[PDB]
């Protein structure tokens, strides 16, 4: 896959009454997330 | 609030069809997120 550490910009929503950042499939090509990976989200 | 910038790590996971990362409420805390805020996801 890609090298770690890429990342992409998106916004807090909610969703099934959960707050969530929802990942679309590009997002994950580009920066190469398969459901399980760990991830780190930063507040801008 | 808090100084922007800061991070957790949490997980991918799906939720009704979606890739989602779930932001506990704590996490909102500490970071500073409400719904609608703009964040950065970064893969680890």
Same mark, same amino acid.
């Given at each position: #896959? %890609?090298? %770690? #550490?890429?990342?992409? +910009? $998106? @916004? +807090? $929503?909610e969703a099934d009454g959960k707050r969530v950042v929802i990942i679309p499939? $590009?997002? @994950? $090509?580009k920066v190469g997330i398969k459901v399980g990976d760990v991830v780190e989200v930063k507040k801008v």
């Amino acid at each position: #896959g %890609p090298m %770690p #550490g890429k990342k992409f +910009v $998106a @916004r +807090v $929503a909610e969703a099934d009454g959960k707050r969530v950042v929802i990942i679309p499939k $590009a997002e @994950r $090509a580009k920066v190469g997330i398969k459901v399980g990976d760990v991830v780190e989200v930063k507040k801008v």
